[PDB]
Coordinates of C-alpha atoms and ligand atoms in Angstrom, one line a residue:
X8 CA -39.7 90.2 123.3
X9 CA -38.3 89.5 119.9
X10 CA -34.7 90.5 119.6
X11 CA -32.0 89.8 122.2
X12 CA -31.9 93.6 122.8
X13 CA -35.6 94.0 123.5
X14 CA -35.4 91.0 125.9
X15 CA -32.5 92.4 127.9
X16 CA -34.5 95.6 128.2
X17 CA -37.7 93.9 129.2
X18 CA -36.0 91.9 132.0
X19 CA -34.0 94.8 133.4
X20 CA -36.3 97.9 133.1
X21 CA -37.4 97.3 136.7
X22 CA -33.9 97.4 138.2
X23 CA -33.1 100.2 135.7
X24 CA -35.8 102.4 137.1
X25 CA -34.7 101.7 140.6
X26 CA -31.2 102.9 139.6
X27 CA -32.7 106.0 137.9
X28 CA -34.6 106.7 141.1
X29 CA -31.6 106.1 143.3
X30 CA -29.3 108.3 141.2
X31 CA -31.9 111.1 141.3
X32 CA -32.4 110.6 145.0
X33 CA -28.9 111.5 145.9
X34 CA -29.0 114.9 144.1
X35 CA -26.1 114.4 141.6
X36 CA -26.3 117.8 140.0
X37 CA -27.4 119.7 143.1
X38 CA -23.9 120.9 144.0
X39 CA -20.3 120.4 142.9
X40 CA -19.2 118.0 145.6
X41 CA -22.2 115.8 144.6
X42 CA -21.4 115.9 140.9
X43 CA -17.8 114.9 141.9
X44 CA -19.2 111.9 143.8
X45 CA -21.3 111.2 140.8
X46 CA -18.2 111.0 138.7
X47 CA -16.3 108.7 141.1
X48 CA -19.3 106.4 140.8
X49 CA -19.4 106.6 136.9
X50 CA -15.6 106.1 137.1
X51 CA -15.9 102.8 139.0
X52 CA -18.7 101.4 136.9
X53 CA -17.0 102.3 133.6
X54 CA -13.6 101.0 134.9
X55 CA -15.4 97.7 135.6
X56 CA -16.5 97.3 131.9
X57 CA -13.4 98.7 130.2
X58 CA -12.0 95.2 129.8
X59 CA -15.2 94.2 128.1
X60 CA -15.4 97.0 125.6
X61 CA -11.8 96.1 124.8
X62 CA -12.2 92.4 124.7
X63 CA -10.7 91.0 121.5
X64 CA -13.4 88.5 120.6
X65 CA -16.2 91.0 121.2
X66 CA -14.3 93.5 119.1
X67 CA -14.3 91.0 116.3
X68 CA -18.1 90.6 116.7
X69 CA -18.6 94.4 117.2
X70 CA -16.4 96.6 115.0
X71 CA -14.6 99.4 116.9
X72 CA -16.3 98.3 120.2
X73 CA -13.1 99.3 122.0
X74 CA -13.5 102.9 120.9
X75 CA -17.0 103.1 122.5
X76 CA -15.6 102.8 126.0
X77 CA -16.2 105.9 128.1
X78 CA -14.0 105.3 131.2
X79 CA -11.3 107.2 129.4
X80 CA -13.6 110.2 129.2
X81 CA -14.7 109.9 132.8
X82 CA -11.1 110.1 133.9
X83 CA -10.8 113.2 131.8
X84 CA -13.9 114.7 133.5
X85 CA -12.5 114.1 137.0
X86 CA -9.3 115.8 136.0
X87 CA -11.4 118.8 134.8
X88 CA -12.4 119.4 138.4
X89 CA -9.0 119.1 140.0
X90 CA -9.6 115.5 140.8
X91 CA -7.5 112.3 140.7
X92 CA -9.0 109.3 139.0
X93 CA -11.1 108.0 141.9
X94 CA -9.9 104.6 143.4
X95 CA -12.3 102.0 144.7
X96 CA -11.5 100.3 148.0
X97 CA -12.0 96.7 147.2
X98 CA -11.2 94.8 144.0
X99 CA -13.5 95.5 141.0
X100 CA -15.6 92.9 139.3
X101 CA -13.9 91.7 136.1
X102 CA -16.7 89.7 134.4
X103 CA -16.3 87.6 131.3
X104 CA -18.2 85.2 129.0
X105 CA -22.0 85.5 128.5
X106 CA -22.5 87.5 131.7
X107 CA -20.1 90.1 130.4
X108 CA -22.4 90.7 127.5
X109 CA -25.0 91.8 130.0
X110 CA -22.6 94.3 131.5
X111 CA -21.9 95.7 128.1
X112 CA -25.6 96.2 127.3
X113 CA -26.0 97.9 130.7
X114 CA -23.1 100.1 129.9
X115 CA -23.8 100.9 126.3
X116 CA -27.5 101.6 127.0
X117 CA -26.6 104.1 129.7
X118 CA -25.1 106.2 126.8
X119 CA -28.5 106.0 125.1
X120 CA -30.5 107.5 127.9
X121 CA -27.7 109.7 129.2
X122 CA -29.5 112.6 127.4
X123 CA -31.5 113.5 130.6
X124 CA -28.3 113.5 132.7
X125 CA -26.4 115.6 130.1
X126 CA -29.2 118.1 130.2
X127 CA -29.0 118.6 133.9
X128 CA -25.2 118.6 134.0
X129 CA -25.0 121.5 131.5
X130 CA -26.9 123.7 133.9
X131 CA -24.0 123.3 136.4
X132 CA -21.7 124.7 133.6
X133 CA -20.5 121.3 132.4
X134 CA -20.4 119.9 128.9
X135 CA -18.5 118.0 126.2
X136 CA -15.2 119.9 126.7
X137 CA -15.4 120.4 130.5
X138 CA -16.9 118.1 133.2
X139 CA -19.5 116.3 131.1
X140 CA -17.5 114.6 128.4
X141 CA -18.8 111.1 129.2
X142 CA -22.4 112.2 129.2
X143 CA -22.1 114.0 125.8
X144 CA -24.1 112.4 123.0
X145 CA -22.2 110.2 120.5
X146 CA -21.1 112.2 117.4
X147 CA -23.3 110.1 115.2
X148 CA -26.4 110.8 117.4
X149 CA -27.5 108.8 120.4
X150 CA -30.3 107.1 118.6
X151 CA -28.5 106.2 115.5
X152 CA -25.3 105.0 117.3
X153 CA -27.5 102.9 119.7
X154 CA -29.5 101.3 116.9
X155 CA -26.2 100.5 115.2
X156 CA -25.0 99.0 118.5
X157 CA -28.2 97.0 118.9
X158 CA -27.6 95.5 115.5
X159 CA -24.4 93.8 116.5
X160 CA -25.9 92.7 119.9
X161 CA -28.7 90.9 118.1
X162 CA -26.3 89.5 115.5
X163 CA -24.3 87.7 118.2
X164 CA -27.2 85.2 118.3
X165 CA -25.7 83.0 121.1
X166 CA -27.4 80.0 122.5
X167 CA -30.7 80.8 124.3
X168 CA -29.0 79.7 127.5
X169 CA -26.2 82.2 126.7
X170 CA -28.6 85.1 126.2
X171 CA -29.9 84.0 129.5
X172 CA -26.6 84.4 131.3
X173 CA -26.3 87.8 129.7
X174 CA -29.6 88.9 131.1
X175 CA -28.4 87.6 134.4
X176 CA -25.2 89.6 133.9
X177 CA -27.0 92.8 133.0
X178 CA -29.0 92.4 136.2
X179 CA -25.8 92.0 138.2
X180 CA -24.3 95.0 136.4
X181 CA -27.2 97.1 137.7
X182 CA -27.0 95.8 141.2
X183 CA -23.3 96.5 141.3
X184 CA -23.8 100.0 140.0
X185 CA -26.0 100.6 143.1
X186 CA -23.5 99.1 145.5
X187 CA -20.9 101.5 144.1
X188 CA -23.4 104.4 144.3
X189 CA -24.3 103.6 148.0
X190 CA -20.6 103.6 148.9
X191 CA -19.8 106.8 147.0
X192 CA -22.7 108.6 148.4
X193 CA -22.5 107.2 151.9
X194 CA -25.6 105.2 151.8
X195 CA -26.3 102.1 153.9
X196 CA -26.4 98.6 152.5
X197 CA -29.3 97.9 150.2
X198 CA -30.4 101.5 150.4
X199 CA -33.0 102.2 147.7
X200 CA -34.9 105.4 146.7
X201 CA -38.1 106.2 148.6
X202 CA -40.5 103.4 147.8
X203 CA -43.1 104.3 145.2
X204 CA -41.0 106.9 143.6
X205 CA -41.2 107.1 139.8
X206 CA -39.0 108.8 137.1
Ligands
HEM1 C1 -30.9 109.4 136.7 C2 -30.2 108.6 135.7 C3 -30.8 107.9 134.7 C4 -31.9 108.3 133.9 C5 -32.7 109.6 133.9 C6 -32.0 107.3 132.8 C7 -32.9 107.5 131.8 C8 -33.0 106.6 130.7 C9 -33.9 106.8 129.6 C10 -35.1 107.8 129.6 C11 -33.7 105.8 128.7 C12 -34.4 105.5 127.4 C13 -33.6 106.0 126.3 C14 -34.2 105.9 124.9 O1 -34.8 104.8 124.6 O2 -34.2 106.8 124.1 C15 -32.5 105.0 129.3 C16 -31.9 103.9 128.7 C17 -30.9 103.1 129.2 N1 -30.3 103.3 130.4 FE1 -30.8 104.7 131.7 N2 -31.1 106.2 133.0 C18 -30.4 106.6 134.1 C19 -29.3 105.9 134.6 C20 -28.8 104.7 134.0 C21 -27.6 104.0 134.5 C22 -26.6 104.6 135.6 C23 -27.4 102.9 133.8 C24 -26.4 101.9 133.9 C25 -25.7 101.4 135.0 C26 -28.5 102.9 132.8 C27 -28.6 102.0 131.7 C28 -29.4 102.2 130.7 C29 -29.6 101.2 129.6 C30 -29.0 99.8 129.6 C31 -30.5 101.7 128.8 C32 -31.0 101.1 127.5 C33 -32.5 100.7 127.5 C34 -33.0 100.1 126.2 O3 -32.8 98.8 126.0 O4 -33.6 100.8 125.5 N3 -29.3 104.1 133.0 N4 -32.1 105.5 130.5

C-alpha cells in the first residue's frame, strides 16, 4: 500500500464487496419500483456527501471538486420517473475534517466502478438523458477522470494519523450506505447479503 489512494482501497475492499453483494441482493434493476428504491438510496448517500464535494478548502485542494457532485443528477433522475426528491426520515450525517475525506473517496470511487450498474440500468431503458444520469460515465472517461482524482487525493498528503481518520471515515461511509439501503429496501438491521456470496 503505497499511495493514500491504494491504502483507502486496501482497507475498504472487504466492506465494499459486502455493499456490492447487498446491492445486487435486493435486485435493483429487476423492476421499476426497485430501481426507484435504488435511486432513493443513491439520493440519500449523495446528499450526505454534497457538502463535502462543495467544501471550500477541499475545492482549493481539488480544482472543480464541487462540479463532481452527483446528487444534483440523482435528483434529476428521480424526477425522470415522476418522483419527488426522496426524503430520509432521520437527520443525515454531515461529516467533516479527515473523516470527510474518507466519504469523498467512497463517493468518488463509486463513480469509477459504476460501469457495471450503468450497464444493467440501460437494459431497463435508462441512460444519460433519462433515469441513469448519475451512473453515466464522466465525459473525460471513468478511468482518466478517476486517475486525475486520485492525483489530488494523494497530493493532500495529510499526517499519517489524518490518513488514518480518513480510512475510518471511508469505512463509516460504507456502513452508512448499507443502513440507508436496508431502510430503503425494507431490510432488517445489520441485514447482509447471503454469506459466502461473491461479485
Ligand atoms: C452492485 C454495485 C456495485 C458494483 C458492481 C461495484 C463494482 C465496482 C468495481 C468493479 C470497481 C472497480 C473499478 C475499477 O477499478 O475500474 C469499483 C470501485 C469502487 N466502488 Fe464500487 N461497486 C458497487 C457499488 C458501490 C457503492 C454503492 C459504493 C459506494 C457507497 C462503491 C464505492 C466504490 C469505490 C470507493 C471504488 C473505488 C475503488 C478503488 O480504489 O479503486 N461501490 N466498484
